Symmetry: C2
Subunit: 838 residues, 2 copies
């Protein structure tokens, strides 16, 4: 019979190229001991220039004696970007593509007397394998399961494009009945002919036998037999939806006809559903209007990269499912079998695509490798009823339009692009007539003008109005114009999202301040448009997670921070906005302050400091308390309510409650609050560390020091603040700080900074980063005394590099008046911190 | 005037040796751009064998035109373990010791017409500098502030052992009056004699002027002039305590006598307190009995090492102060000026020591460097009234008695050790007649037998009964025995504590399971002994933080996890045990489940799963609710109550309530719960991932995958569990897993593992690690329902010892059970974990 098990354990690894590394007798004792899954690119979570090249893997294979007469199939579920397999020094085969499986019959190369050597040469530098461009890290290594499967000489074909070799589909489905087709290949690897019986057993969702199909077959030695068996039509089929994920098990078994002894067996699920996409009325599932409530999911986790164990894939799935998602865009590459298994069985519709992104290059062999990857994806995941649509391109004009401006320059590239797109559409439809084709576009009409949008069955728009420029209302406007101009192209919003950073909060959130609050504003605008617009089939939020993209700077360098959950899968508060909107079956009541647990604010006297506390909920009304005091009830709108909360005590307890479907519902949490005096005097300076995020309207709380840097404020008599200047912002990474966003904002052309404070000795810390890559040079004086004659941050440290300078100052006045004196370029300040010492 | 500012910015760094690295014209454009503070040993948070050797730092100095006529003083507050300073290629000076400041007048080496090159060669491999042994990482680099100070040619001496050059103390203090001695040195670096006026101005705590002292002084060109001025006695001084940290500012000023022009100015605090240690009655502060409620604090933070900014030092202090500590053992080395400032001003008594630990080596120069470091600590930190005691050795017999078992080998080492201890005690008392000397011992009477305990004023015992062997009650027994035999030696319990790991929880906590709950049992035992025993002056908990110690394995390799707070300074729940016990002025009500937010347990049918929920509180009575349902009121004892909580729903809200000082007090939080069926059937296998920590009585929740692995349970009819074998445990690091504690426990000589479960296709994952390196070697087969799945598995042969193996098998079950059996071939059969899912 069949035996399948992993060989993930007991590997040796070497980064780089290496002489004789495939040889059996090679000494690899000084190599690194590792366990799969593995990537050699955990460096990508700190370094922009992560290693792209070769890595070698070696494992001993000592085979059971029980396998001596069996075929042994090696399966690598994934290796990025390409792999070459050696057994005992001999090249067995290779695979191009980092997200699809490969498999090899390795029986001829193996010994059963001596130990065998499996060596794999993996390469992630190859420019002829998709992706060659895209907003994520191209991790190198063997980062999914590796298997050995031992089968008898007559067995199902396990070397058809790394798949199971069986293909099951439902040519007709309706409420009244459905048909079922069961297809595949049997291989006879014996030296003699064979007479076999093939059986398909089909089971109802409750597990009872529905039907048995039997068929005798005869195979010559070495023959591959292709079968295609139709079942008795299924009457009143139990239909599959994400809410009701009814699956019919199909067990396919192979027996020696005479002896009836079992040879090979393969289980799959099938399911009964039909669907369609309408340009006017949206998506339909089993005849009923159905809104696609979707998310996109990248497959990495800081700092292990894509080297996730399968319980981590299931963890991700369960978080998405508990959020109320009914649709996933598995992007930009096909993903672990463990994920798709959950989509089938727990219920989530799915879109899966291969990573042809940004530009079709004139790279020899690239097209041929994409075609193969498309066949591999479709054949490997053919039997997942959750999957309703295949894609192969994402924003394929984005870099093209950046690199080539003139119609002359564009012509060859657009020809090449349109040709590859039409070629893959044909391949797609050859491989699978039972699913819909899709393509994702960036927000430009060039996808219509070039003809790209005529090619697939449906289209996806990746839309970011209100994030990458424009207005939030430009979203529904863009879609309305698409629908007017191309009403027969059904639309999914295949990406939308906004970046956020737990460290940043704003009372006046703006795009690219990276505040938690602005992402909320953005998503609170987008989700109702998706829900309420009939010609929007649905949307897939970009992204479920904060994910690895080594080329990114912005507030969290190396990370795309548009997640609904943090990289460690802790949900952001806004996860519960979705959960409130998408789950009616349970009460949802979430105080949205888990992202904002370390609060501070300027206080007048001993009066409370008011800060907003948001609530996400599907209750119609909620009451918030702080340290036992009611702040009143509020009616919820768009699944949310915000309270203006009086902060005073240092460790307040927030508590909310209301009623849902007849039951009382509650939430609560403690947070931290630190008041900062508006008016400094000798008493309130003790223990005070007055820190200011100059040039910003955000609170910045360091996740390294836990200190909150307040939003900038203009000087007023009796108080403290800036004099003159204008806000400036950069998104380039700042060297030599963990507190990037503090230095990425500044007050430019600043004239002064003033604190009204008592006489004494003070520690003043000035923060600089020059972000304007003649060169800015300026003096600094404090209360009439020169503290810097001629400071040039860029001459001293270079651009985009933090300088933190502390000064001890003796104040013999009733104020500390810091003045900037420009001699070249402009004066700027990125942060300031004051403490009284004496 | 005096100008003091950092030069922490704009450095270049190179690890390793580099010829000509000091030269002004050297090309460092490919070096690494860094900002101080800096360590080159962030590797220690992953690698045991962290780099010890040389590192080079280079900065350009372009001096202000306004400094042309000034003296320029360079101060490195710390460089581990040694630094050699070069200015424009010229060797300016050097320092040995990784925790004390050094300073240099660099004026002679600088040009004001051209840019200057500052180069520092730092070395953390040197064996003639303490520590050479100890349970912490010897981080290399310049990890505290670096300063330039510009002063006139007449100024206060800034190159006396890296100190401020002024020394203020209170020779007599009582409630009625106190005396005040203001001493220091003035330097005249000018070619002309100077006639100067020295002024001391003394302010009351409320900032009003108390007294002005003025003195004419005359210095020859080049002279170092020592001054010593007595203030008028202070009548009815406002006394300093941690609770009432009253400070008197002393402002010292130097003016040119003829012109009256201000030259230099230096501020310090003084304060008035007196204290006493008694062998029977403990510690007294300002004539009153006073229990020292202490913590120890190491100075690193994962993953930045000791390269903390000063707001991080202040964060640490505020956390300790808010817990109600009134005493800090600043150990095993002196720490940032930022920390001591807060001890003075916000109020905490202090013990500070240098790191002479484990064994006194026979290394030339070692003793001399220790003496210099002691003098440097005392002079640099002289003016902190928070400090009441200086130490210089910790567990100085520990490695000695491990290494040397013969009297011939021991005798010279003990001779050497007693010699150095006596040498440093003399130095301490020469340097400071105003503070108490202390030494910390490991828990052995040999410190008395060797005579080490007769040297210092007081003694510290580092005690771990109930952790490193023994019963918890052995703690108070040890101390009673000391008090009996050495009644005149006043005692501090200078270390005590137990390791914990947020990932591990146990209903039956035991030592070295690293559960959160055992550390709680340990500390709940110790703290009342400390509080209630009169002849115990107090204790300093080891440690406030989970800290770097690269040589450690155990549950969190590279980390000593005996903290009250995690490395990132998030408090553990037991922080709030201390807070409840030590804060009377605020209500403390803490549901002690922040360490246990991801719960799971075996469920019978649909009945609730009971798990304990502890509360730490200074309330006398508390009520706990789960999802709005009251679980009743319990009376608290030892600042705690535990409820047996019925879990069922997936995301329960826990809420606690009570009254304190006439007001309602509340706490609450949500946590996650996952029920696991005791009896598998087709219904409840859907979406189930049944994971078990074989060989352990601990729940293990992975901080990587968030999956909880259940405590092991014996097979019972209709259920699932192990057959045969006994528990085994290792503390060695396990390779190739983030989930070390899962692999560090196993069931040895296991016979089977069984799940009663319906027919179907299952994924079985088996976890292995061979922990018996002293093996002959373990080889075994495994069958599942008679099907062989391994005919000859040997973890140690295939992967080696202490390395994770995780193997997945797909099996087809045509029975009503899944019966995994282990078949010995060689050595023993073992299993470290198992996980089951139904696939078809
Ligand atoms: Ca997998
Ligand atoms: Ca400092
Ligand atoms: Na800023
Ligand atoms: Na275990």
């Amino acid at each position: 019979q069949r035996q399948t098990q992993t060989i993930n354990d007991s590997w040796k690894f070497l980064k780089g190229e290496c002489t004789a590394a495939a040889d059996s007798a090679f000494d690899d004792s000084k190599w690194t001991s590792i366990h799969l899954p593995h990537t050699w690119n955990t460096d990508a979570y700190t370094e922009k220039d992560y290693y792209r090249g070769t890595g070698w893997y070696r494992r001993q294979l000592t085979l059971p004696q029980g396998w001596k007469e069996k075929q042994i199939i090696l399966r690598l579920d994934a290796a990025g970007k390409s792999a070459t397999i050696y057994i005992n020094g001999k090249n067995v085969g290779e695979h191009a593509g980092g997200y699809t499986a490969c498999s090899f019959n390795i029986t001829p190369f193996l010994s059963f007397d001596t130990p065998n050597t499996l060596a794999v040469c993996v390469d992630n530098a190859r420019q002829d394998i998709a992706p060659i461009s895209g907003d994520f890290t191209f991790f190198g290594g063997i980062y999914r399961d590796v298997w050995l499967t031992a089968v008898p000489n007559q067995h199902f074909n396990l070397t058809n494009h790394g798949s199971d070799g069986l293909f099951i589909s439902t040519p007709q489905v309706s409420e009244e009945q459905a048909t079922l087709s069961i297809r595949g290949e049997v291989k006879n690897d014996a030296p003699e002919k064979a007479t076999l019986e093939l059986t398909h057993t089909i089971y109802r969702p409750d597990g009872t036998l529905l039907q048995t199909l039997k068929k005798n077959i005869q195979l010559k030695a070495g023959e591959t037999y292709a079968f295609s068996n139709e079942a008795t039509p299924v009457l009143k089929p139990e239909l599959w939806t994400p809410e009701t994920p009814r699956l019919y098990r199909v067990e396919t078994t192979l027996r020696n006809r005479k002896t009836k002894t079992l040879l090979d067996q393969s289980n799959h699920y099938t399911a009964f559903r039909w669907f369609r996409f309408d340009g006017d009325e949206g998506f339909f599932l089993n005849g009923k209007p159905y809104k696609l409530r979707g998310i996109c999911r990248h497959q990495d986790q800081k700092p292990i990269g894509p080297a996730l164990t399968d319980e981590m894939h299931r963890r991700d799935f369960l978080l998405m499912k508990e959020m109320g998602a009914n649709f996933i865009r598995i992007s930009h590459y096909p993903q672990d079998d463990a994920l798709l298994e959950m989509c089938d069985k727990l219920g989530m519709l799915a879109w899966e695509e291969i990573p042809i992104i940004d530009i079709v290059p004139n790279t020899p062999g690239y097209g041929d490798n994409c075609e193969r990857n498309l066949r591999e994806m479709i054949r490997q995941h053919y039997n997942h009823p959750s999957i309703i649509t295949w894609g192969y391109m994402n924003e394929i004009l984005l870099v093209t339009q950046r690199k080539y401006k003139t119609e002359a320059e564009l012509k060859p590239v657009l020809e090449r692009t349109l040709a590859l797109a039409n070629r893959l559409e044909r391949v797609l439809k050859e491989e699978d007539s039972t699913r819909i084709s899709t393509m994702a576009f960036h927000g430009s009409n060039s996808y219509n003008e070039t003809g790209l949008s005529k090619i697939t069955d449906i289209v996806g728009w990746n839309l970011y109005q209100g994030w990458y420029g424009g207005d939030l209302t430009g979203f529904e406007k863009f879609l309305a114009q698409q629908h007017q101009n191309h009403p027969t192209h059904p639309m999914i919003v295949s990406e939308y999202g906004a970046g956020s950073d737990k460290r940043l909060h704003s009372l006046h959130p703006r795009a690219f301040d990276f505040s938690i609050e602005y992402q909320q504003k953005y998503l609170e605008h987008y989700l109702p448009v998706l829900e309420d617009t009939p010609y929007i089939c649905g949307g897939t939020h970009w992204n479920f997670i904060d994910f690895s993209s080594a080329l990114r700077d912005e507030s969290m360098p190396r990370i795309n921070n548009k997640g609904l959950v943090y990289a460690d899968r802790t949900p952001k508060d806004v996860y519960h906005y979705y959960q409130a909107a998408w789950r009616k079956d349970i009460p949802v009541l979430h105080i949205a302050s888990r992202d904002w647990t370390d609060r501070a604010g300027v206080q007048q006297g001993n009066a409370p400091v008011y800060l907003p506390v948001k609530i996400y909920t599907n209750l119609s009304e909620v009451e918030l308390f702080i340290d036992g005091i009611s702040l009143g009830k509020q009616k919820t709108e768009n699944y949310t309510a915000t309270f203006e909360v009086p902060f005073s005590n240092r460790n307040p307890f927030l508590f909310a409650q209301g009623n849902y479907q007849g039951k009382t519902v509650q939430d609560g949490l403690r947070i931290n609050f630190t008041p900062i005096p508006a008016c400094l005097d000798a008493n309130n300076l003790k223990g005070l560390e007055l820190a200011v995020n100059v040039g910003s309207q955000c609170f910045f709380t360091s996740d390294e020091s836990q200190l909150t840097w307040l939003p900038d404020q203009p000087y007023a008599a009796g108080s403290w603040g800036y004099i003159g200047g204008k806000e400036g912002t950069a998104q380039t990474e700042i060297q030599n700080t963990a507190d990037g966003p503090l230095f990425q904002t500044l007050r430019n052309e600043i004239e002064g900074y003033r604190f009204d404070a008592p006489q004494g000795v003070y520690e003043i810390e000035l923060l600089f980063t020059d972000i304007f890559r003649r060169e800015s040079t300026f003096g600094i004086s404090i209360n009439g005394e020169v503290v810097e004659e001629s400071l040039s941050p860029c001459k001293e440290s270079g651009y985009f590099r933090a300088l933190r300078k502390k000064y001890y100052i003796t104040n013999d006045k009733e104020y500390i008046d810091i003045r900037f004196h420009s001699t070249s370029g402009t004066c700027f300040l990125n942060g300031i911190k004051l403490r009284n010492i004496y």
